[PDB]
Amino acid sequence: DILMTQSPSSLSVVVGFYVTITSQASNNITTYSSFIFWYQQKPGQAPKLLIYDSSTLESGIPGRFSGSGSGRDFSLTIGPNQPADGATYEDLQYNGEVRTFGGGTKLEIKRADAAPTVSIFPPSSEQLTSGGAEVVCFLNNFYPKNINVAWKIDGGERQNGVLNSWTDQDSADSTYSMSSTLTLTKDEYERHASYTCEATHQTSTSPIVKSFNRN
Amino acid sequence: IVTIFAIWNTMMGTSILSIPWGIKQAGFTLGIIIIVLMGLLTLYCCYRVLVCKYYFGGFGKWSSLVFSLVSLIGAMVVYWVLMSNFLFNTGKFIFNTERVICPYPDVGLEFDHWWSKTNTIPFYLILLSASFFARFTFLGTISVIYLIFLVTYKAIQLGFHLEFHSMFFVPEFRTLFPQLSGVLTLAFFIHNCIITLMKNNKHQENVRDLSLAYLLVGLTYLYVGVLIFAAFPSPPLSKECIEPNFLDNFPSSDILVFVARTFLLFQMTTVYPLLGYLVRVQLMGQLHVFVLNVFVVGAGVLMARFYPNIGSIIRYSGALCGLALVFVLPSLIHMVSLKRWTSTLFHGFLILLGVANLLGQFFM
Amino acid sequence: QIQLVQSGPKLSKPGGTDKISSKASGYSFTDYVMNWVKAGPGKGLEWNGSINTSNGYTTYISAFKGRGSFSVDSSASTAAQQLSVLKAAATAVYFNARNFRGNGAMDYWGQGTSVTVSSAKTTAPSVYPLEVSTGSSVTLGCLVKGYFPEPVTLTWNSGSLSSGVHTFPAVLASDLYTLSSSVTVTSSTWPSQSITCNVAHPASSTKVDKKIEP
């Protein structure tokens, strides 16, 4: 059983720049051509073969992918970066009777900072007639990933009943997105009027607030 | 003496280049037992001689000549197939690699280099002998001695492995035990020139010299193929991979592989005019013709261009011939010429095994 | 066009069993080797065994000897894998992939098979359109709430609306999933045209269309 220690675990690079992902094998995966390979995997997609036999480039893969190394120390380089490289990269050895993978390397494309576009949604009519009520607040196409969102019910920072979700980095504009849906009851939702959605980000000292009044 | 070496030299040649594959078919611990068992019967059969004069009469007649012919027909086909494999690889070595490959089947620079046909023009001209034998013999000793140096030095370059028992390996007692027996019969390609040779030496217990040459040739074949089968990168690669020709598991350019293929190509080239035009023409007869040469050349040419699985021919040929002269004719002749306790029962069994081998090849 | 297409998403009961298939097309099935791989959450990939087809020999990794069982249907050109007696830990995505010996890594992969191990009951989703509450561009939404297990496919106007869309990943809360998606179209497009939300949940035989109105 061969251990593949892959470093770094995370890694951010600006567009137009090297990334140097490295692999270090516990034993030696060389037999006569060295048997390491590099894979790329975007979310929800099958992994994609970039480089076989450490340094030979698959057909169809762009030339900006290069492989080097032999024996026990291997490195992968992406010549110039494009946003289509935002994924996780793994290395594989097909040399021992128990094939092993690396820990993975999550590449993050660094773009110019970009402020989120915020929009808020009150409960629907079909929602209430069946009971219950939720307030959705979308934060779309922003950068960087770090962002915080705080709810307010009539100025009361309420924190119970929140559910968030985040998109992986967009493969075109390298932005993020998030959906926070605050869920209450029809009976508790009607006990107020003003529901606000506050979002603060690197781009602004002053948080972005989107609010509405029930009636 | 000189005669053991002489017998050992003639028996070798290509025959061997298809042994690890036979073992992969049969199995590792089984193939070794097949080679031993096949080696005792083959040496035992060679004992039972005391050609055509001994196989004349008894209502059968020239049935042995056609069977003897098949052994000659297929050797010509193998060299034709083998030459293109060696000729084309020799060419691809042009000036403007310790690698083992499981080649992909189904078989500018491409298209035009592999023809097998370009080969036919030089062969047709030469097929018209004493000079070819003068040029020959010398090249067979070099090739088999070089080839066994390669098998050794390549096995030392990476061999060990082996796990006995599956995806990387192959079972030790595979069911394809009969194909190895079929390929292995031709390994004893002498049962047709011993008596025309055995008296050329000082004779008399003769028997020891005959047995020793088999043990040598038994050991030479067994030493070979074991190292190849026991050293092939089974944990990166896998068995199964060893396509019948063992050198086939080497690619486009190995300097050790290239030298060995070229010595064989030089060896076979000088042996084929002498094997066809000097031998096949005589047995058939039993600008004059120049059309019998066409059918032997043509059958092998079509074979090599089409289906060029060498072990697919060393089983049928070597096995149909073996059932014939190797085994049906010695037991019957001994029995017919007896003039029991258990000798007939033993002899009958061996006849059954010959027919079993031909039957065995048809059945997977 | 080489292609490995796998079976659909499976919901297995604890202790239950299932069989996962992969249908090869575009190459001689017996000239290549079929391999299987596992992808746990966050954790890397795990080779769980492989099988040669010309001679039927398999090789496992000891960590999986006793869960994965390998088959090959040499005529159908498909390769199957059986996972027996599942627990919560075996919930992952199972990939299958081609491999030629030596001169090759795994060059072609299947689209993936998601296996969920839970005793929960399949519920159908409740879809709610997110109306807008004023001059730039406008963003719409569709909210999918209270469903299980996890496929669900969400499109806008039957797929004729692909750009400007954000389909968010489901989140689990008390054995039920909730999903949300947004489109941002021009102020001149809505509500002049009709924009509807297409939610499908094949486990519960549910297909819903939901038109966003002011």
PDB file of C-alpha atoms in Angstrom, chain B residues 104-106 240, chain C residues 24 27-34 51-56 72-75 77-78 98-101:
ATOM      1  CA  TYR B 104      -2.808  -3.582 -29.294  1.00  0.00           C
ATOM      2  CA  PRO B 105      -4.095  -6.335 -31.635  1.00  0.00           C
ATOM      3  CA  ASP B 106      -5.948  -6.086 -34.965  1.00  0.00           C
ATOM      4  CA  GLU B 240      -2.408 -12.698 -20.778  1.00  0.00           C
TER       5      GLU B 240
ATOM      6  CA  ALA C  24     -19.553   0.261 -22.714  1.00  0.00           C
ATOM      7  CA  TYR C  27     -14.527   0.105 -28.419  1.00  0.00           C
ATOM      8  CA  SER C  28     -13.860  -3.615 -28.252  1.00  0.00           C
ATOM      9  CA  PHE C  29     -14.985  -4.541 -24.748  1.00  0.00           C
ATOM     10  CA  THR C  30     -12.440  -7.327 -24.175  1.00  0.00           C
ATOM     11  CA  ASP C  31      -9.328  -5.376 -25.251  1.00  0.00           C
ATOM     12  CA  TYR C  32      -9.546  -3.119 -22.163  1.00  0.00           C
ATOM     13  CA  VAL C  33      -9.879  -3.472 -18.394  1.00  0.00           C
ATOM     14  CA  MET C  34     -12.789  -2.207 -16.292  1.00  0.00           C
ATOM     15  CA  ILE C  51     -11.546  -6.891 -13.594  1.00  0.00           C
ATOM     16  CA  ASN C  52     -10.054  -8.146 -16.845  1.00  0.00           C
ATOM     17  CA  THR C  53     -12.709  -9.235 -19.317  1.00  0.00           C
ATOM     18  CA  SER C  54     -10.918 -11.549 -21.776  1.00  0.00           C
ATOM     19  CA  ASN C  55     -10.039 -13.920 -18.913  1.00  0.00           C
ATOM     20  CA  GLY C  56     -12.464 -12.898 -16.163  1.00  0.00           C
ATOM     21  CA  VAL C  72     -19.144  -8.786 -16.677  1.00  0.00           C
ATOM     22  CA  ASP C  73     -21.837  -9.499 -19.264  1.00  0.00           C
ATOM     23  CA  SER C  74     -19.514 -10.178 -22.180  1.00  0.00           C
ATOM     24  CA  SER C  75     -22.325  -9.977 -24.752  1.00  0.00           C
ATOM     25  CA  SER C  77     -20.624  -5.154 -23.263  1.00  0.00           C
ATOM     26  CA  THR C  78     -21.541  -3.949 -19.760  1.00  0.00           C
ATOM     27  CA  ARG C  98     -11.560   2.092 -18.563  1.00  0.00           C
ATOM     28  CA  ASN C  99      -7.918   1.058 -18.393  1.00  0.00           C
ATOM     29  CA  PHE C 100      -5.493  -0.446 -20.897  1.00  0.00           C
ATOM     30  CA  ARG C 101      -2.520  -2.190 -19.322  1.00  0.00           C
TER      31      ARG C 101
END
